[PDB]
Amino acid sequence: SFVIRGDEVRQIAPGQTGKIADYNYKLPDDFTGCVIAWNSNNLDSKVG
Amino acid sequence: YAWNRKRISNCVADYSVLYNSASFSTFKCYGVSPTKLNDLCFTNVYAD
């Protein structure tokens, strides 16, 4: 489970490359699973 | 419609700085991985 950014979500997938995809988390090419994403602005977005 | 073309040649290129810039929203390369780009040498590079 992650805190990743919205524009970033694309990166949690097999082939992609990018900031998170390289340094933070790397899904394998062969990945067998699902990627479930839902923005939780309410839970963690405070003023400031 | 007017698109400008610039000719770049006779030098050495550091593309990694371009890749390692947070500044570009989209950096998609068709044919080169953005990394390992430093390894290539070309006759003429055109920038639009």
Partner: protein
């Protein structure tokens, strides 16, 4: 058409697709060659 180029050119996730094109094709060519040889060899063995 050059394997070393593709390797130098693309990261694995993308490169795998391109190389695959060559392998299926090249192998098919090699397959074609072998079939020709077997048939041709039969002719020669017939002569032998």
């Amino acid at each position: 058409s050059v394997l070393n180029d593709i390797l130098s050119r693309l990261d694995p996730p993308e490169a795998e697709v391109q190389i695959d094109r060559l392998i299926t094709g090249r192998l098919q060519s090699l397959q074609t060659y072998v079939t020709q040889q077997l048939i041709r060899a039969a002719e020669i063995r017939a002569s032998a």
